[PDB]
Symmetry: D3
Subunit: 309 residues, 6 copies
Amino acid sequence: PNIKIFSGSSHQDLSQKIADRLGLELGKVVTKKFSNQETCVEIGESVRGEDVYIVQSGCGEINDNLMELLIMINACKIASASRVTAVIPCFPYARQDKKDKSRAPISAKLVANMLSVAGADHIITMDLHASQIQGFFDIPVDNLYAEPAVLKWIRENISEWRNCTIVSPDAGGAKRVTSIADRLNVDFALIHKEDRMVLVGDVKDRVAILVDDMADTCGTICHAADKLLSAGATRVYAILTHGIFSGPAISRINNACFEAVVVTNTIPQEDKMKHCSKIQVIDISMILAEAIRRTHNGESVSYLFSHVP
Amino acid sequence: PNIKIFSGSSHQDLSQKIADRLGLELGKVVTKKFSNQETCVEIGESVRGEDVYIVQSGCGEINDNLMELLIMINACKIASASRVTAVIPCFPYARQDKKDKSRAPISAKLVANMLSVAGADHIITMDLHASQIQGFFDIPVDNLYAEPAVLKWIRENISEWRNCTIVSPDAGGAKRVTSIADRLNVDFALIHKEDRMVLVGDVKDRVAILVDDMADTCGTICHAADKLLSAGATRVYAILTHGIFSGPAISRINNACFEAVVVTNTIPQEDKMKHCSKIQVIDISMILAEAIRRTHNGESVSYLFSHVP
Amino acid sequence: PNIKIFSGSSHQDLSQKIADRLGLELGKVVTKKFSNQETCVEIGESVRGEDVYIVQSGCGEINDNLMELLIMINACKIASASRVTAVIPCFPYARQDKKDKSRAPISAKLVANMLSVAGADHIITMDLHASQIQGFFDIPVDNLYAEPAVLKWIRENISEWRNCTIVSPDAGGAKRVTSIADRLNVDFALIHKEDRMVLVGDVKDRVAILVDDMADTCGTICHAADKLLSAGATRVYAILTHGIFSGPAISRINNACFEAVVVTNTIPQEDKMKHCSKIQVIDISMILAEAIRRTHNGESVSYLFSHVP
Amino acid sequence: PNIKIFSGSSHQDLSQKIADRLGLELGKVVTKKFSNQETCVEIGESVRGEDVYIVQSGCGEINDNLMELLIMINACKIASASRVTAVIPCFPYARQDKKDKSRAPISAKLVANMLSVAGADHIITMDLHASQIQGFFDIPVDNLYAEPAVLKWIRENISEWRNCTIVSPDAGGAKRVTSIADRLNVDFALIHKEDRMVLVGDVKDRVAILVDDMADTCGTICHAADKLLSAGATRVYAILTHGIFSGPAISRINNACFEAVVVTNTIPQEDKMKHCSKIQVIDISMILAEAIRRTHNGESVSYLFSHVP
Amino acid sequence: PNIKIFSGSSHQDLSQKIADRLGLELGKVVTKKFSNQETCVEIGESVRGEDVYIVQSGCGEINDNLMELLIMINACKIASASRVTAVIPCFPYARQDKKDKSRAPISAKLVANMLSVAGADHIITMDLHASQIQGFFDIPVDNLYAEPAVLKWIRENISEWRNCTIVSPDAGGAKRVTSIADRLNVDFALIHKEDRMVLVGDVKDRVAILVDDMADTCGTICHAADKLLSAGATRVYAILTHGIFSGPAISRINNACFEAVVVTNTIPQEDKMKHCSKIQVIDISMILAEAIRRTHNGESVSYLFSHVP
Amino acid sequence: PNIKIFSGSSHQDLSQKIADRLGLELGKVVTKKFSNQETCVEIGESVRGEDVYIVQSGCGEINDNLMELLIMINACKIASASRVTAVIPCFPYARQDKKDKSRAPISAKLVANMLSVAGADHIITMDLHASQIQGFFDIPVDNLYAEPAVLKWIRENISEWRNCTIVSPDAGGAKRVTSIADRLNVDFALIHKEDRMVLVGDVKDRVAILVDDMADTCGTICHAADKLLSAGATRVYAILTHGIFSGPAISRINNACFEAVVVTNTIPQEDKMKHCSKIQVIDISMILAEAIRRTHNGESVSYLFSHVP
Ligand SMILES: Nc1ncnc2c1ncn2[C@@H]1O[C@H](COP(=O)(O)OP(=O)(O)OP(=O)(O)O)[C@@H](O)[C@H]1O
Ligand SMILES: Nc1ncnc2c1ncn2[C@@H]1O[C@H](COP(=O)(O)OP(=O)(O)OP(=O)(O)O)[C@@H](O)[C@H]1O
Ligand SMILES: Nc1ncnc2c1ncn2[C@@H]1O[C@H](COP(=O)(O)OP(=O)(O)OP(=O)(O)O)[C@@H](O)[C@H]1O
Ligand SMILES: Nc1ncnc2c1ncn2[C@@H]1O[C@H](COP(=O)(O)OP(=O)(O)OP(=O)(O)O)[C@@H](O)[C@H]1O
Ligand SMILES: Nc1ncnc2c1ncn2[C@@H]1O[C@H](COP(=O)(O)OP(=O)(O)OP(=O)(O)O)[C@@H](O)[C@H]1O
Ligand SMILES: Nc1ncnc2c1ncn2[C@@H]1O[C@H](COP(=O)(O)OP(=O)(O)OP(=O)(O)O)[C@@H](O)[C@H]1O
Ligand SMILES: [Mg+2]
Ligand SMILES: [Mg+2]
Ligand SMILES: [Mg+2]
Ligand SMILES: [Mg+2]
Ligand SMILES: [Mg+2]
Ligand SMILES: [Mg+2]
Ligand SMILES: [Mg+2]
Ligand SMILES: [Mg+2]
């Protein structure tokens, strides 16, 4: 079986970058809409006996992109692909991972069930909002981390990184920032709201680096940055793997004191970058390409958790 | 267990009509979108031990509405509803019911699988594009027919119906028109394309009635009507259960010779009716309400196949 | 994994032809009946790690043959075959593919479920009565077409084929005849019953060729042929992939005006050919052998939809 | 939900007896064959919301009857029956319950899987060949025993039963005979083959009673009876729940020394009784009717293991 | 269907308390071990058609108790119980809810799968370690909260509760303490380790109340209490729903400065209470009994999230 | 894919012997207990794309070992092993293979379901208590036999084996002893209890060899040996594949007249051998190693049923 990479319509540039890193052309697929807006999918080449990877991020018109992904998986499965892998850099509905007191769906579990029944044998994703989502599946799920690329960016872009501070915006994700601070051998200052915020960790005259899994409306990072600037930090950075930037996010970032808002390209960023000068993108296509290549070859994927390829 | 009717966002007016016919209020549900356009669903009342019916048609923004339906089903299922029934008047992706020579998905089967894995115990739908779709499910599926309401409309609106002709637009659905002609005791003239059309059945100086399951772009019925008017029919009617009317449909209908284009209200029609004077709507809410009531009470549903309630 | 071909008891000659075309011997299997008429199956050679193909058509004693097929699949699956494929040239219960108004089983879906639970990983079949049956499965289904062999027969056996007409007997299957007429570049005359029949398409002084998926009691083709001979066709042919010929079929064919009734050998025909001189058989063993070989080698199967091997 | 009893074609008289004991009429069902010998099933009354019991024994044309049962279950399940129970007095393929050294199917497990996928929620059967077959299902299985009726027959028909001996024909089923002997407070003599047979237990000048689950070819009981008559037993009886009597069974029984061969009516016996004067039938319709009634009412079924109703 | 409560061997006193609150006797069940230490289960009364609740906490010999629970569920399911509910006050393997960088099982998901395949239709549990565990199931899961009982205890046992502080021991569970502080209208001071600890929130001359889901080795609460006593808190309390208290826990509690260590009785505490004077128990049997009663009657369970019955 | 052998904690020496025979090192795995006695499993090497075999016998602390096996299977499955095989020399809960009149679990079926849902693709076991257990699975199960090794031991250790007698202790397993006697060409004397025992087959002045699948409390073999010594057998041997030896077994063996009690090493025997001088062990690691090697290479496993490797 050979690797076949197919792109959904959500993130074409990322799929092309992945395909170039693998020395492959993107598989021929027609992904459009019928007149009544139903998804139309046509696999333009035989996938019989091949190892198929479908790249689609949970961004943009999320329900359309998710339906397209499921329809593509189904088309490849009934076309006798030997294995079908969904490469989902940003997992849709990941924030609906529990009920907790409300008569609400667990939408992430529903998405996992739909991916399974569509025929996915394997999932590759990056920085799941909650790693318990891996347990929503019965098929293997490789949850990659942007952390090696983030560490590389910090070392090559922040001159005072040895004295900086790594700040979690909410108490929930402080595990990520502790791992990053341990890797950099720095202090991890913490922030949480009580309309007021409380911060532990000396930030005065230092650089503070907010790290989080995603920025949707940027309410979380803007409040944290306001707090940090209250406590005398010389500069504040925000680093996120998923740059969703919906709603009022671009205006809030423009009016905030961030030196830089760095995101990975798990979601296309060109349109947002046009309207916001302080957004910078870390390419993670090498990590995804290496994960695809290693799953195909039976090589260790977890080696990527700590190594930039 | 009591009947609880919940409406999705696709067809609120139909759900309200159904609820009024059952003497019930619509269940409290919040169905909206998060900032990043992910579906947000919140069941506003306990459904524990209840017989839940969720009304959502495959129309409008089809992928959003389908996701909303699946999320609502999941929310009701994990909220310990005794039974969950999807009331889907127009089944989405019904026209993708086979591959036939192409490397294509069977999207209708995927939709059936998704509805099943979401937790639906029962499906109620109207005039499935292909009744083989019933076999795509392992749960019971009640496929209702608009034919009794169509016959009622014909008898009360076409003065010359005893001399009229019932015409199938494509060879595929001529079964429907034969059943209708047998019920009315009239001739069924047939039409199919060879850019030219061929018609069997005397239509001269008579009324011809085109009957079909749906009109999407109205290419099918406009070509058939052109043929019929070539052969001297005094008036031509089109009657359809599903009035999708996407793309150039309204302009084609406006420029065509139809005396009337009658559709059921399985899909909301007010916006289309604003731009097209010859569209008339048959209310089928009584049929859906009776089906819901009979499934709840253990009464015969097939009795509705031949009786207007 | 190597190809292993096993024959059920239904069509031994077809299985042998397939095995010869693949350069293989039929696998050792004992398929008989216990005293109380329960099916007895004994796999006479190890199939561990092999790619197993079981050839059984839905003909003869259909329930016995279907049980035998399921039992063989189960025996091969629990004997650790790497993959089990049911090669079912004529799919049993294919005509019970829907309910449509009656309190009836969808027997084709039940058969698909039984094949799946027995352990079949893949289905190869020819000219399914309804291609929606492919959606009754969750495993891949390769639905082969007799059309290339039919076109070859027409070109090599009917001297006036460039002027002939391709006639559908019922409105349902006219898609097949349109494809054939497009391939031959001829007119497709159509027939359907109203005890009287209506025909469109000049057949006078021409050869008419009825094409259909199967002839069971031959009521369908005999009525169509009577109509065609009413309209002056010089000769009438019938061509079918599945020659079931049950009940009064042989007598009706003998008393009908067919120049020839051509069937494929998806069903054994020698006994019927003894009693009916106008039955001729097209061998489709090359198509089935090529499909088996291509699925085994990961080669394109759809290439066979348009090419005679 | 009300009880609905449907009969398959295998054992109509038993189904009628069961229905009379329940004070019910048999449900309207058409169970016949199409021209090509495919099973045709038509449920003649609504079963929506009802508790459906389908009576079909694994006898006669076993594969036809099994297919008919599965098709009926499927028809009732997709007709929205609240619960479907297969009442299978003699379970087909029960003797193929293991492989043991051979490359053979476990056909009983396949049958269980097929019954489950057809939609059966519950199985009622009598004297399974191996009670481990209950573990082949994931749905509940009530395995009834003919033993109370057998004990009643022994007490009312064998004058010397207090001095008799209960003999197992093969070592496998001696558990049944020990239970019977314990109930009667008598000795259980045992027999097994070494073309010679060995017997333990004084049988001289006594009545010996062979007890077994079934008599198929009667090779087992005729050999055992020959042995018993060698050792001076005044009379020999055979008692079996399942009287299959296939092959040479009737001739062997006619030429054997049995005083009586008693069977239950889990299988119709009239035709066999015509050709064999020493066959007598125990009616077990009361046990099956009580089991149906108790499962419907939520009453203890195991109470029937020791009580004649 | 009637309620039947069965106790596993893990927590007999809790099951008895639940049964008394429901006005029921515990169902007759034999739960012991064979000589080779395999679990032996015997249901001593018919459960046919009943609503069965099996009470077993994930404590003590956890693997034995989990096996016993699964075996009991299986026994009740194949005995035709109408519904089987696992009442698991402390969910076993809840802390293995993710992999996160290691080649480790997701044991909680495995436990959920095992409970589902054993036949559980419903799960009732209290204070799941991660509420995402609800998404590990496809059956409904009611995750009850000890918070109402905790609030009642605080108000009736701590005289200065209006001035107290609610402290989370680890950053992960601070959601619980924020909910509790909001209910009490007090400040929530937070603690996390950097062998040193950092605390935000004035605790000087006040009572601090540590709240957490469980105390296993009490390393978490003892370190937090040491920190709190460093910052001048007059008294420190610990309140936990699950008092596992394994390993060195009792000695650490005895040597720590806790005024009180309060636990619920989701786990039996008498043996631990013998060796530790500062352990007090909150009875939560009323909450579990109300949940059982409300699920049985189709009443709202979420009403218990905020109301002490 | 390469073979990876992992050992559970139950039988480390057997796993090492198997690994040596395959020329492999045991895979790195940490299998221990958390403080609260929950199983902790950590796979110390990548198994991605490998053929994983996990060796764990149903002995010792059976519930702990079974949980450990399931957790290891789950860890390997979600770590993307190409195939996972449970090598279970002594299958736990095998004696609970049926209900038979009691409201009891079928625990063996539950264990099979748990192994399947954990992710096992294949089971290798030795001398299942009932071979019907193979039908409890839907995955392939290779049930190996100790008989070739037993025959080898008999020929090399009992000088009078040509005149010996092979005795079944209970009527149930006499099939094993008939196969052994046929292989050795000797008589098979049989024993069963009526507190008294009955024996057929001349044993006077001969060696009697009891053969059975397992000895748990040794009540079965000690009673049989007492009977045999009553009838003048010069020596009595017992040979068993599974030496469980729980409860009073060692004392009964010490006080019994056995010349030797031979067991295989499907269960560790060193501790029991310390306290009982007449226990001897047959190594079956070559049979298990050959089965693993042959399943990996696609070679015939059934060849081992009659051949010592
Ligand atoms: N796409 C979405 N956009 C915004 N909010 C969402 C979205 N999906 C779910 N939510 C809601 O957001 C909330 C989840 O918030 P969040 O993940 O930030 O915190 P948490 O899960 O409570 O805690 P933490 O992640 O810190 O452990 C829920 O109320 C959920 O319904
Ligand atoms: N939403 C859609 N809008 C338009 N075309 C669609 C849609 N979904 C599927 N199709 C395409 O339309 C075609 C199906 O057309 P249609 O149902 O009219 O005819 P058919 O299935 O070939 O025959 P018939 O229904 O007459 O038996 C397929 O090529 C399918 O891919
Ligand atoms: N083996 C069989 N022999 C005869 N009739 C059968 C068989 N199996 C099913 N039928 C019946 O035949 C009918 C199906 O007929 P047929 O397939 O010719 O037409 P259709 O499905 O209505 O339309 P079309 O195939 O033209 O789209 C149904 O009433 C079905 O119950
Ligand atoms: N319908 C059938 N008629 C005859 N033989 C059958 C039938 N089905 C299976 N068999 C075969 O009969 C044998 C099973 O025989 P039987 O049930 O009498 O003994 P057993 O299972 O070996 O032992 P026991 O039942 O005494 O414990 C197997 O070889 C099986 O393949
Ligand atoms: N029974 C157990 N006893 C002790 N440790 C366990 C047990 N089960 C799992 N663990 C381990 O404990 C760790 C989980 O710790 P914990 O739940 O306290 O923190 P977390 O999940 O990392 O974060 P948080 O719960 O604060 O969001 C994992 O390494 C897991 O393997
Ligand atoms: N681990 C165990 N230890 C002891 N007894 C057990 C164990 N598991 C199950 N049992 C019980 O042992 C009995 C099964 O006994 P056994 O297997 O010796 O005979 P059988 O199945 O009745 O007949 P046979 O195996 O001779 O055909 C059942 O009552 C079962 O509940
Ligand atoms: Mg967050
Ligand atoms: Mg159409
Ligand atoms: Mg046809
Ligand atoms: Mg048997
Ligand atoms: Mg027998
Ligand atoms: Mg914690
Ligand atoms: Mg046993
Ligand atoms: Mg035994």
